[PDB]
Amino acid sequence: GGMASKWDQKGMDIAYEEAALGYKEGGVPIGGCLINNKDGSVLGRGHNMRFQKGSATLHGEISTLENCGRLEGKVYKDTTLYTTLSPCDMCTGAIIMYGIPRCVVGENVNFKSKGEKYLQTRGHEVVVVDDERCKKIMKQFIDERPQDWFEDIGERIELQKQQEEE
Amino acid sequence: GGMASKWDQKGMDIAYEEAALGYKEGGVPIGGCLINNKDGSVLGRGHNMRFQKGSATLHGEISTLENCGRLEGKVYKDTTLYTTLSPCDMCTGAIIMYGIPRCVVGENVNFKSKGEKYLQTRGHEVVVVDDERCKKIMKQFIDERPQDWFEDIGERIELQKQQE
Numbered sequence: 001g002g003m004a005s006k007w008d009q010k011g012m013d014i015a016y017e018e019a020a021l022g023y024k025e026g027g028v029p030i031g032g033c034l035i036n037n038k039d040g041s042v043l044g045r046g047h048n049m050r051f052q053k054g055s056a057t058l059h060g061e062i063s064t065l066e067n068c069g070r071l072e073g074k075v076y077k078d079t080t081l082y083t084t085l086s087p088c089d090m091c092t093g094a095i096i097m098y099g100i101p102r103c104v105v106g107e108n109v110n111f112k113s114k115g116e117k118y119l120q121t122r123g124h125e126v127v128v129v130d131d132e133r134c135k136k137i138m139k140q141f142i143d144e145r146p147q148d149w150f151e152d153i154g155e156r157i158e159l160q161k162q163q164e165e166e
Numbered sequence: 167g168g169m170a171s172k173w174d175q176k177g178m179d180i181a182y183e184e185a186a187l188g189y190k191e192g193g194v195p196i197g198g199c200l201i202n203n204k205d206g207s208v209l210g211r212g213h214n215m216r217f218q219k220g221s222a223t224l225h226g227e228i229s230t231l232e233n234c235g236r237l238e239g240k241v242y243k244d245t246t247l248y249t250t251l252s253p254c255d256m257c258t259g260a261i262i263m264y265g266i267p268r269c270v271v272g273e274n275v276n277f278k279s280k281g282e283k284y285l286q287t288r289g290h291e292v293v294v295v296d297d298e299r300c301k302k303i304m305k306q307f308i309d310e311r312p313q314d315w316f317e318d319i320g321e322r323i324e325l326q327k328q329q330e
C-alpha cells in the first residue's frame with residue numbers, strides 16, 4: 001500500500017530485532033511483527049520459540065501472531081506481517097486464514113517455500129526487502145546447526161542423497 | 167493404506183474426546199491427535215486453546231502438534247493427523263510443512279476451507295468420515311457462541327454476507 005508500505009522500514013527493523021534476540025537466546029534467528037496499516041501501531045512482535053519453549057509450532061510468524069492476542073477478525077484485514085525469512089507453508093497458511101493482506105519479507109535466499117507464490121495466488125501482496133542483516137544471521141544458523149534447521153522446516157534429512165550429490 | 171486406515175476409528179475417538187474436553191473447558195470444541203501409522207502409537211493429542219489460553223494460533227490441529235513436542239522431520243512422514251473439523255488454511259499449512267501424509271477429518275459440514283482441496287493438490291490424502299458426534303458438538307458451539315466461532319476463523323459476522 002502507498003500508505004501501508006510507509007511502515008515497512010519500521011516493521012522489518014522490529015522483525016530483525018526479534019531475530020537477533022532469538023539468536024542470542026540459542027534459538028532459530030527468525031523474527032516478526034504485525035503492524036496496523038492505519039496508524040503504524042505494532043500489534044505484536046515475536047521470534048521462533050522452538051528452542052526456548054520446545055515448540056513445534058512457534059515459528060517467528062506464529063509467535064508474532066500469538067503475541068498480538070485474540071483479535072477481532074476485521075483487525076487483521078488492514079495489517080502487514082513482517083517476517084525476517086520468507087514464510088514456510090504453515091506460516092503462509094496463517095497469513096491466509098487471517099486475511100492479512102501484506103507480507104513483507106526480509107530475505108528469501110536462505111529459504112523459500114511454495115507459500116511465497118501461494119500467498120500471491122491467493123491475493124496477498126509479498127515484498128522482499130533483501131535485508132543483509134537477516135541474511136547473515138540466518139546463514140550463520142543454517143551453516144552451524146543444519147540438523148536443527150531441518151527440524152524447524154520439517155525436512156527429512158536424506159544423507160544418502162546428499163553423499164551422492166556432493 | 168491398510169496399515170494406516172486401521173487406526174482411523176481410534177484416532178477419531180481420541181480427537182473427539184479432546185473436542186469434548188475443550189467444550190467442557192469453555193473453548194471451541196475442536197480436537198486432534200497424531201498417530202504413527204506403523205504401530206498406531208499416539209504421538210500427541212490436543213484441542214483448540216483460544217479461550218483457555220487467549221491464543222490466536224492454538225487451533226486443535228496446531229495444539230495437537232505442539233503437544234507432540236519437537237520431532238525430527240522423518241517422524242511426521244508416516245503419520246496421520248486426525249482432526250474433528252476440516253482444517254483451515256493455517257492448519258492445512260502445518261500439515262504440508264511437516265509432510266504429514268494423511269489427514270482424517272471428522273466432518274466438513276460446519277466448516278471447510280480451500281485447504282481441504284489444497285492438501286490433495288499438494289499430494290496429501292484427505293478422508294472425511296462424517297462423524298455425527300463431531301457435527302453435533304460443533305453445531306452446538308456455533309449456535310451458542312457464533313461471534314466466538316467467527317473469531318476462531320478470523321471472520322466478522324455481517325448480515326450482508328448471508329443477505330446475498
Ligand SMILES: O=C1NC=C[C@@H](O)N1
Nearest residue numbers: 030048059060087088
Ligand atoms: O520460524 C520460522 N521457521 C521457518 C520458516 C519461517 O516460516 N519461520
Ligand SMILES: O=C1NC=C[C@@H](O)N1
Nearest residue numbers: 196214225226253254
Ligand atoms: O481449531 C480449529 N479452528 C478452526 C478450524 C480448524 O483448523 N481447527
Ligand SMILES: [Zn+2]
Nearest residue numbers: 059088090091
Ligand atoms: Zn513458518
Ligand SMILES: [Zn+2]
Nearest residue numbers: 225254256257
Ligand atoms: Zn485451523
